[PDB]
Amino acid sequence: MKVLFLTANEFEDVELIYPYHRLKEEGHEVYIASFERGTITGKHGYSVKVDLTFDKVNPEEFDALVLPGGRAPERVRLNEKAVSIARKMFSEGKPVASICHGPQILISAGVLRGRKGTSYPGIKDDMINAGVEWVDAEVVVDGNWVSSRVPADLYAWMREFVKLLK
Amino acid sequence: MKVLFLTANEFEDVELIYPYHRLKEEGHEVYIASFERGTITGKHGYSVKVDLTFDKVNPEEFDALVLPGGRAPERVRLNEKAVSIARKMFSEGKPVASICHGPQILISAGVLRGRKGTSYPGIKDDMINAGVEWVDAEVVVDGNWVSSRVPADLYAWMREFVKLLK
Amino acid sequence: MKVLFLTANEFEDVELIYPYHRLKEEGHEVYIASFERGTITGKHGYSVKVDLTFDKVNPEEFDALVLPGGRAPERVRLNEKAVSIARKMFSEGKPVASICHGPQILISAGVLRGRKGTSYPGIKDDMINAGVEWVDAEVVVDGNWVSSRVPADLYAWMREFVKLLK
Amino acid sequence: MKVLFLTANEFEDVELIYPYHRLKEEGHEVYIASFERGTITGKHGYSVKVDLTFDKVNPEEFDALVLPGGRAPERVRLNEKAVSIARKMFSEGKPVASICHGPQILISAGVLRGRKGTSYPGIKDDMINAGVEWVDAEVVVDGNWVSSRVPADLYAWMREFVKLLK
Amino acid sequence: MKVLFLTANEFEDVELIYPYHRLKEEGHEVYIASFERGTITGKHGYSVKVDLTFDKVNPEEFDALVLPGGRAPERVRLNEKAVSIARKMFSEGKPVASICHGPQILISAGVLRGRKGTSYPGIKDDMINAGVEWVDAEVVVDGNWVSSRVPADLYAWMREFVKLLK
Amino acid sequence: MKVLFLTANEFEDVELIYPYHRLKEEGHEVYIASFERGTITGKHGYSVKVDLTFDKVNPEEFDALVLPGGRAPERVRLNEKAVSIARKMFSEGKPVASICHGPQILISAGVLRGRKGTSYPGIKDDMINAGVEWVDAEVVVDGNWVSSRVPADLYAWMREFVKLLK
């Protein structure tokens, strides 16, 4: 499996680094996509290398999608290509894992109406206004969409996501 | 005029400090409400004194409302009392100034359907999903609601808001 | 009216940003002059664009002068061109607004003997030794010179300065 | 299984948080021991709750040991009780995972002579002088001792460690 | 000899720590005086213990005076007692070492007219307005007054000061 | 005398700056060597200019060696040229001053077996495993090697080291 991450500067550090390594443990290949080649830096100062830009991403070449939180989703969701990647992969039924502010990208992709999931509670109302049946739970599994709220949910988040890739 | 601010830790410093002094210049009384008495600190390290808590606010003794941005609105909008203050003052047609993430509180108050305004572009889709006719402009005036996007808009934001007050 | 700001890195953030937007509100054009083109960053991390260098400034093309505080004035006052700009505009009777450490530039310009004003209390003795009648007040108006002490004075500072610009 | 963490302020954040959640996913109980009850903060500013003090640890009540790195090991290795915990658990053949500066605690326990492992390259000379056959590899498995070097090794580090706990 | 330091929070770290240790090498006793007991923290984050408060200082019980720079002198020079200490010791001819912003305290003590010395170049004009013959030199010795400009001058500053205490 | 400093980014600021100026006071010439030309920045944010790279150092052109602490030694000790410089100067019996983590470089040079000295207590066991008779004292003098533990020891450290360069 090839796993794509859509992220940018000001990502929540552990919400990117934890699924990155957890999926590598399984032997999946993990790819970080962002605006520009080079490095990006998290809220807490961890730097990670960008593997490819949004413009170079063909969503048909990836099997699953991870959306870390932080402040990066509010910039990534203004990128028509990045939102388009999320829309197609989510629409095709490929596994999509979101945590915290991550699902702001899915809101912008227009794919969440009638779906069930969670997010950082601070944006629950925006999830609800997008048509999500929002629940306060450490992990929600709604078909291909695995969603969690905060870094304390990491263990449950990837426990469920890893099952979807098996 | 008595002007109420709803804010918290991690407010955007100049988005609070600028209207605070701009409205003081006009002779209005300005009040900072937050979760707890004491002080709150902005994203950039400015400290501000809290005048009263959300719980102690009677919205009928205030004439106008200011909603600065930063990360504070995502905390403030989870406080039922703070959201009701904004809902009541806005629905009564009292002047309400919002900037950046400030209008997340108005989203949560359920008052934006059919209204016209702007915000930090990063949350445009959330404004639109709440029923806002979202405009990309340095300042928008929709009756009692004066909205702006980013600190570069400060001059235009209060230029319009000061007109609504007396 | 064209309003010039003389400043540099380590400016006190709100002492620059507040009058910048307050005077823009009136429709005045505002210009930031510093050592180099590019950007400068305040004590608290706000960045602002430099419009022109001290060397490119013709003081005859500007109508008023604003001197924000911070650590920048102790650097600007060593620049002979910057001090000559302040000397020429102040002695010509053009409106000059200073706050906090701002008037260190006026001290070095040699224009303060016999004047009345205020500053950050920490440099009260240096103002006095320059011949200033130093007053502990939120704003002082001495002809063309409007002076204040600290960020808490911003509202009164620009309230008085805006009057001088009509 | 009950898994014990020995750590303190200035731990390398992901080197604690990653194995913490990875082992929770398996259903193991994880416990953070440090000098004082309360919270500890990592190099990058993440806060974690301390479950018990070194004084309260009975090593017979735990099945495995994790030693995150950062600057914390250099303080922990001066604590006679913490070093004793590591000495007893490692010598008993219980699974011990160390990464980066973590094995400085094992150096101080005097248990590494004749063993094979890795560490932050910066302390390879100290590992070698303690009697370690030092290997430059993302993960080494030497009986009960699973060692890795840097955050980039996290996926391999816990891949091998979880096998030992089954 | 007993050497007294007058300083406070935001002292320039090496301008305090360097003479502190340099004079300890000679066998002198060194005392840190500030506003309150406890610790004070320099601009760069070093902490030092306060030995006594300004109120408790009897100037006749100390043989020499050191005035480090930073932002502490602008606060110390507003304390009538601290300024009184400096006034008495300097006017009595006891050795006084100042660097950077340090001499702002001597300016406020009113003892510098007719004297020869240096300072951080940024306050040169304030020194001159206090009546100082200001010299751009790494160290100046004017009787009991040993003055320097910046941290790069430290070696010369204490080279001259230790001679005065022999 | 020409004194060489081996250091890098994240040096303990006062552990470099203090001996730098103390030895300049004696009239010695002081040289900062690091990985690259330009500047390096200490843990506390002090900036110092690099005089030459490790690659350009001819150890025969220097009379004495200073090894400040911080986190720089853990990177410096991985550079074969830097370690060879310390090994050769120490082996020639030239004066070598180390403090805190400084002696990690000497550990890596393999020159400490049978020698007597001290270090940051946190690496006591690594010094002992390198063959050092470790002493808990503010300064130790073992022939050409003058060693100390922490910034609090600075006065005694250079008190003893300066004697070796007379």
Numbering used by the authors:
A (entry chain E), B (entry chain F), C (entry chain A), D (entry chain D), E (entry chain B), F (entry chain C): 1 to 166
What's written in the study?
Here, SAXS contrast data from an oligomeric protein and a protein–RNA complex are presented in the presence of iohexol and Gd-HPDO3A, two electron-rich molecules that are used in biomedical imaging and that belong to the families of iodinated and lanthanide-based complexes, respectively.
Importantly, the experimental CMP (0.438 e− Å−3) was well within the range predicted from the protein sequence (0.420–0.443 e− Å−3) and the linearity of I(0)1/2 indicates that the oligomeric state of P1 was preserved at all Gd-HPDO3A concentrations. The CMP thus determined (0.411 e− Å−3) was significantly lower than the range of values expected from the protein sequence (0.420–0.443 e− Å−3). In order to probe whether the specific binding of iohexol molecules can improve the quality of the SAXS fits, we generated P1 models with a single iohexol molecule bound in two distinct, opposite locations: either outside or inside the hexameric ring. P1 structures with an iohexol molecule modeled inside the ring improved the CRYSOL fit significantly, in particular in the shoulder region between 0.1 and 0.15 Å−1 (92 mM iohexol data), while the model with an iohexol molecule placed outside the ring decreased the quality of the fit. In parallel, the average electron density of the P1 hydration shell decreases by 10–20% with respect to the bulk at the highest (618 mM) iohexol concentrations.
